[PDB]
Amino acid sequence: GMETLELQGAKLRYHQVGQGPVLIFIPGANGTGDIFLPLAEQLKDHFTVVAVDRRDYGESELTEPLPDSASNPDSDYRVKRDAQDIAELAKSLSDEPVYILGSSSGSIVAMHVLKDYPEVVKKIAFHEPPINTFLPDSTYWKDKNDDIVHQILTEGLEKGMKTFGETLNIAPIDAKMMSQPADTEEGRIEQYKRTMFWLEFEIRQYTHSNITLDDFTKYSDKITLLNGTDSRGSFPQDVNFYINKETGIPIVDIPGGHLGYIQKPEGFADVLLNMWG
């Protein structure tokens, strides 16, 4: 049971309980207003407690996707947009400046609400802010944040792909090709996005999907199985050997490895022309 304010680019959802002057709670890391609901109950007889799901979280919905620069660590799009959400939320519920509390990164949003929309602010509270920009040692703390985020975003992935490599016995050539960075940064950032997506939304769902041997036998005359000449011993060739074992469907060898169609396009094509040309 949530309220909705439609705004530029999002349906902003929020709880509202009580009577009197409006009191907006801005969540921190958890991003959602439910975490203030026991606090609201203790306040609903003095303030109209409004507790927001910030537009990227919870029951709030984006109506158009984030800009691609939002992943840049010095992008200001999201913090400024959250702060404008709170100001428009205030302006839609009150004709007076309102009370505001933010906690942790939510208190940083609160700082930007006061900076950019001081006319909506009656009183404001910053509960344990982690912003570092104005500290004498801002650099130390910014560098810690950057390096721990970098570790999280990269280490486990690198290890897991190598573990995939040994477990599946991927050929060296494929391994280097399949894990080579892009010459640009716009192409390099996309490639982490894409790999993360394949991992969460493709590999498990597709490799355990609803194909039976019976499906191949039904139309056996149509099917060729292809094994690369440079990827012998790898797990997908064993998939083809098993299909062939149980169905009789022929295996054709074709040049290159798992990526043979671009490792060796000429020889790849010569085989496809022999089969189908």
Ligand X SMILES: *[B@@](*)([O])C1=[C][C]=C(C(F)(F)F)S1
**Residue numbers at the binding site for Mg ion (CB under 5 A):** 84
Helix (H) or strand (E) holding 122: strand 121-127
Residue whose entry in the numeric block shows the structure tokens 């490792």: 263
CA dist., res. 127 & res. 111, Å (int): 11
Give the shortest CB-21-to-a second copy separation in angstroms: 8
Q: Name the residue type at position 15.
A: H
Q: Does 255 bind ligand X (CB under 6 A)?
A: no
- Closer residue to a second copy, CB minimum distance, 4 or 69: 69
- Of 35, 93, 157, 168, the residue at the interface with ligand X (CB under 6 A) is 168
CB proximity list for 60: less than 8 A, separation 6 or greater: 10, 11, 12, 13, 52, 53, 54
Length of the chain: 277
- Closer residue to a second copy, CB minimum distance, 19 or 154: 154
Site map (CB under 8 A) of a second copy, residues 140-179, x = contact: -xx-xxx-xx-xxxxxxx-xxx-xx--xx---------x-
User: Residue 248, by phi and psi: left (phi above 0), alpha (psi -120 to 50) or beta?
Assistant: left
Site for ligand X in 187-246 (CB under 6 A): 203, 207, 235-236
Q: Does 185 bind a second copy (CB under 8 A)?
A: no
Give the shortest CB-8-to-a second copy separation in angstroms: 18
- Closer residue to a second copy, CB minimum distance, 1 or 38: 38
Report the candidate in 158, 145, 147, 173 with the shortest Cα–Cα distance to residue 231. 173
Q: At what angle do helices 77-93 and 105-116 cross, to 10 degrees?
A: 70
Q: Does 234 bind a second copy (CB under 8 A)?
A: yes
Site for a second copy in 33-92 (CB under 8 A): 35-36, 38-39, 41-43, 46-47, 56-57, 66, 70-76, 78-79
- Closer residue to Mg ion, CB minimum distance, 77 or 197: 77
